[PDB]
Structures are given as C-alpha cells and as structure tokens.
Design a protein around this ligand. Structure first.
Ligand SMILES: O=C(Cc1ccc(-n2nc(C(F)(F)F)c3c2CCCC3)cc1)N1CCCC1
Ligand SMILES: N[C@@H](CCC(=O)O)C(=O)O
Ligand SMILES: N[C@@H](CCC(=O)O)C(=O)O
Ligand SMILES: [Zn+2]
Ligand SMILES: [Zn+2]
Ligand SMILES: [Zn+2]
Ligand SMILES: [Zn+2]
Ligand SMILES: [Zn+2]
Ligand SMILES: [Zn+2]
Lengths: 259, 259
C-alpha cells in the first residue's frame, strides 16, 4: 500500500485552514465537512492519505482550444492525485474522463442576494439590467448557463457572456464579497449548499432567494479505472445509510450558524 | 442486438395501466414517469425494449433464511430481465449485487397522514401509541427502520416489528387506502415522491407532514457487469443536464394535480 494523494479545494465549510495552523504540517492543518468525509472514507476503505490543495485553485474544466483539463479534474486526469474529495459536481463531461462515486450531497444552482435586493427568481434577473449577476468563472454553474436551452437561462447566459466588467469570479469568496460590497447591484449564482452556509455566517447580510434552478450532486472522484473506485463508492453508500452524512451536514452548516 | 427486457413495477405515477388498455399488446399499454424515462434511455442508448411488470410485485429484498433475492432486484440477479427502470432505491445491499446508474430522482422517507391527524414528525409518532404506523412490507423503507441506530427510528422499529395486526402493507396503494380508511389512526411511512404525488390526488384527504427522515435516490439498475451499464449511466446524466428529468417530474406530479 501507498499513501493516497487527495486533491481538494479551499472552500468553506468543506475545507478550511484552521486558525493559526499555516505553519503546521500535514492533515491536522485543515478542518471541514470534506476533511471529516476524507477521514471516514479512508477508514472504511483502509488507506492512509495526504490532503493537498489543488494547485490552480479550480474545480475543473476543459480548455476549448488546448483540450487540457484544469483544476481537481485535471489533477486526476494527469495522475497528480489519486482521489478528489471536495464539493465537486457530478457532470456528464467529467464522468466521461474520471469516475464518480454515488453522490454524497444533493444541491442545485441558486441565487444569492444582498438583503433587500428586489429579486425573487431567475426570471426576475433575466427581465432587468440594473442588477448585474454572474457565476464562478470556472465550474459547473458556468457550464450550466453556457449549455442551457431553457429560455430564461439562455437569456441570462447571453447577458453574462458579454457583460462588462466581467460578472465571473475566481472563487466563491470573491463572489460573496462582490454581493456584499455592491449595495444590491450584484447577485451571485452559486450552489445551494454554499449559499445556505453563507446565509448563516456573519455579517448575516445575504440570502438565498427562489427555488433551485437544477438538481444534482457532489461525488468523490477517482481516475478512470482506479483501484479505489469500487470501495469508495460502497463507502459513500454506507456513510449515507449510517446517518453520517446527515451528521456532518448538521455539524458544518447549522451547528456552525452565526445568524 | 436483442430486445432488452425491462422489469418495472405498477406504482403511480411511475408506471400505470392506461384506462381500458388491459387487452392491448406491448409497451403502449403503459404510461407514467418511468415509461417516458425508459423511452428516453432506450433512444439515447440505441436499444429496442419490452416493458414487463415484475412477477411478484416487489421491489427487492434478500430472504434472511434462503438468501434468495425477490422483486425487481431478483429478476436482475437471476437473469430474468436486462434492466430495471422503476422507483428503485439505491442501497448498499443492492449495490453489492447489481449496478445502479447515478440517481435520476432525489427522495427521502416521509410521513403520510389523513388530514387532521395530530402528528407533525417521526418523534411525535414514536412518543404515542393511539395511532399505528408502518411501511411497505418489502422495500428500502422497512430496511431503513430495521437497521437504524438513531434513537427515534430504533424506537419506531421496535414498535413496528411486533405490532398487531401487522402494520406492513403489500403495496403503496394498500398503505394509502389504509390511511384513508382508518379515521386518523394509521399513518404511513413512504418515500416523499409517492407521498407528494398522492397529496395532489383526489379525494385530497392525505398530507405529507414533517421533514424527510433520510436522503437518497432512485437509480436505473442492471445486472453486475452488464453491457448496458455504462451507456445507461451516461444517459441519465445527459437527461438530467438537458432538463428532461425536471420536465418529466412536472408532467407527472404537478401538471397531474387534482387538488
Ligand atoms: O444520495 C443522497 C441524496 C441525493 C439524491 C440524488 C442526487 N442526484 N445526483 C444527481 C447527479 F448524479 F449528480 F446528477 C442527480 C440527483 C437527483 C436529481 C437527478 C440528478 C443527489 C443526492 N445524498 C447522500 C447523503 C445526502 C444526500
Ligand atoms: N461544485 C462546482 C463549483 C461551484 C460552481 O460552479 O458554482 C464544480 O464542481 O464545478
Ligand atoms: N423505492 C423502494 C420501495 C418503496 C419503499 O420502500 O417505501 C425500494 O426500492 O425498495
Ligand atoms: Zn490544531
Ligand atoms: Zn464510518
Ligand atoms: Zn471584459
Ligand atoms: Zn392507447
Ligand atoms: Zn433525450
Ligand atoms: Zn401479526
């Protein structure tokens, strides 16, 4: 056996640097839902592991020209990591190049506003121009809009793709900060899981509005045909059935609530 | 190529006999969410197929003594069908013997009451004895209670397992009828998808109460190592991303609403 290299991403409350731990070593530096999940998966599957943060800070997309995968997906595709344990969305284009476990969490695209913003739905956003809106610049949310044939979402993409200045952000934290600083003139499209987390964080000035725009899941990813895929998949189902995933959700979202 | 034998189950609104079609032939007899899903899967995967209703009318469980699988799971395990396209819950014990696609629908165990029943939650059910409650006698809901280590659910199982007369039912329709006829003295534990469907059916006398007790998914099942598994899995993701699964949900639940 060898130590399994885990790629993950700094995304609250999934993986966070513990206060004042920057200069410590190894796995103990990090906390969060995916840190606890990695420990359980590794225990059930009988492996030792090293948590690493994805070098480019991205989830994963294929460049249109170079055909090269970036982010966590790229780390798996090019053999830089053995497994990705992160809020990584199961998508068709990714499933074509890596393997996913059954989902460990359900989510959908959602709208985050600064409280008091006169927006209730995606339709509302699409029918006005005063309030700008965008997504994480690389990720499954952007791709959702890029590919949608649904009238409202196609309209939103036509606006977003050419809006100036760019409505896209490099990180979730950047999108949240942009909502908070924009006096109601920027809304952020992000996954319901993140949105619901931030809604319960100080300064308690954002909220989720409207229903989810889609329904999907996060999965644990391994390189195609990995020795780990089968056991990891069975482990996710065991964690689900043993109530552990619900325990972790309660721990990191609502037990954490500051609002 | 050969005609693919599809096993499914008569369960509204997934697969229903069209009015006055009992004496007709082939696939045209049936309608419902899973009928529409089967047509899309078959189109994307490039196969012809025959819809068949599971002979024993069960979802699938392994007998404790004989070790034999019944229901749709058994039809796959013993080679009687090529694929199951039905509201078949993804579970660990099933995943050990058959393959599941990524989920096509999200659901959780839920409580159905006759309107006016003084029950708001599973905790409420567990803390009283006036109102009886039970599950489908063979299925993932029964197994959930049989295996739970959560205090409230363990208490409920201890009651259900020895209650007389039996609190278990052979079919969802039987559980719904039992709620409707029992003057508030029977509550039925069933999947949220079914519960939400029935809530919108005449005579509009039942309702879903409380949050879901768990979170899981339905998947399309194939025998272990089937030639169809890979393509079916990719097809489910395509249907999800193309908004087709959302379209089918709206079609069979809410466009169907009678209340
Ligand atoms: O498996 C359960 C719930 C759950 C159920 C279903 C999904 N997923 N996951 C997908 C996905 F495969 F990602 F596209 C899709 C769904 C339902 C909607 C169709 C596409 C996702 C999640 N969880 C594990 C622990 C908590 C939630
Ligand atoms: N979970 C997403 C990143 C967040 C987003 O795109 O909103 C992904 O796997 O790409
Ligand atoms: N979907 C369930 C049947 C319904 C239930 O158990 O409530 C199964 O696959 O076993
Ligand atoms: Zn420490
Ligand atoms: Zn465990
Ligand atoms: Zn620009
Ligand atoms: Zn007809
Ligand atoms: Zn299609
Ligand atoms: Zn009895």
């Amino acid at each position: 056996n060898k130590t399994v290299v885990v790629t993950t991403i700094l995304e609250s409350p999934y993986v966070m640097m513990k206060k004042n731990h920057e200069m410590l070593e190894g796995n103990e530096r990090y906390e969060g839902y995916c840190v606890d999940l990695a420990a359980e998966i590794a225990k059930h599957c009988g492996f030792k592991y090293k948590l690493t943060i994805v070098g480019d800070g991205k989830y994963g997309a294929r460049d249109a020209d170079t055909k090269i995968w970036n982010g966590m997906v790229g780390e798996l595709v090019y053999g830089k990591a053995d497994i990705a344990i992160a809020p990584l969305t199961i998508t068709l284009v990714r499933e074509e190049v890596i393997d996913f476990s059954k989902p460990f969490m359900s989510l959908g695209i959602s709208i985050m506003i600064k409280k008091g913003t006169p927006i209730e739905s995606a339709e509302d956003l699409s029918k006005q121009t005063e309030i700008a809106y965008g997504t994480l610049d690389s990720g499954s949310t952007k791709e959702f809009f890029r590919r949608s044939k649904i009238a409202v979402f196609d309209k939103m993409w036509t606006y977003m793709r050419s809006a100036e200045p760019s409505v896209f952000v490099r990180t979730t934290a950047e999108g949240v900060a942009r909502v908070r600083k924009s006096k109601g003139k920027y809304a952020y499209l992000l996954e319901s899981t993140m949105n619901e987390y931030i809604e319960q964080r100080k300064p308690c000035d954002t909220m989720k509005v409207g229903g989810n725009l889609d329904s999907k899941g996060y999965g644990i990813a391994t390189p195609k045909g990995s020795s780990l895929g089968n056991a990891v998949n069975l482990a996710v189902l065991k964690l689900s059935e043993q109530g552990l995933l619900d325990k972790l959700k309660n721990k990191w979202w609502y037990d954490k609530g500051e609002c």
